[PDB]
């Protein structure tokens, strides 16, 4: 199971997972290796790749929708600042890694949790939810 | 000096800066602490910072420029995949981490270079702008 295979279980509903937005065109969902509690994948429903080829207007309402995120985890985790990464090396499918930033070594792949708890996740979730409620209200 | 003093000189020109990219809103130039050769600081002029709270329209300018400088250090260094990484819990004037990406481990804070060579700044600098120049035509 590779990570590219799970991530698109995930986005076809045939692997569960923990969803916390979705649009016409882009959903959101915790990653299972996360760089802090929180983490979360913005990701466009159509297949894509490659940030800074893809047009701008599809690139600009990703990152629109990742500012909702970057609000939503902020005000979930109480963080003043949230992390953006775009790497794409490990699933070639367009995410955008969103997640709260307390500490500079919080931006690294190689100290990301690769077993968080099922609370802990669950707990992420439902903040994160709680937190977009609000803020799209 | 603290980073974020650096910055404020190189973006008023009171330190030597290599740019790459300038108009009316945003300028880029090479970092002095890369992350791999090439990293690329994507920044408006205005003063601004949290990239999650900066209005949508001003952000997506922010991001087409990223773009930009993306498929620049993709064909100035010829890598497949460009990074990018907001953080700001060094420097608390928005910009945008836009670098060349070869492995994961290129990503992050845990091994950046703190005295790049004068060489490989020039080296980097004309590359990007003679990339620059067919992009945008």
């Known amino acids: 199971?590779?990570?590219?295979?799970?991530?698109?279980?995930?986005?076809?509903?045939?692997?569960?997972?923990?969803?916390?937005?979705?649009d016409d065109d882009i959903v959101a969902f915790l990653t299972i290796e996360p760089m802090t509690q929180g983490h979360t994948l913005v990701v466009p429903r159509a297949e894509l790749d490659n940030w800074q080829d893809i047009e701008p207007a599809v690139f600009a309402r990703v990152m629109e929708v990742s500012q909702l995120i970057g609000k939503a985890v902020c005000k979930a985790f109480d963080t003043e600042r949230s992390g953006l990464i775009i790497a794409g090396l490990e699933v070639p499918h367009l995410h955008v890694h969103v997640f709260p930033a307390r500490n500079l070594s919080d931006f690294g792949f190689a100290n990301v949790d690769r077993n968080p708890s099922p609370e802990s996740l669950d707990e992420a979730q439902a903040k994160i939810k709680a937190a977009l409620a609000d803020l799209q209200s």
Do not use: D, H, Q
């Open 1 to 22: 199971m590779s990570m590219a295979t799970v991530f698109t279980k995930i986005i076809n509903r045939e692997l569960p997972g923990r969803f916390v937005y979705e």
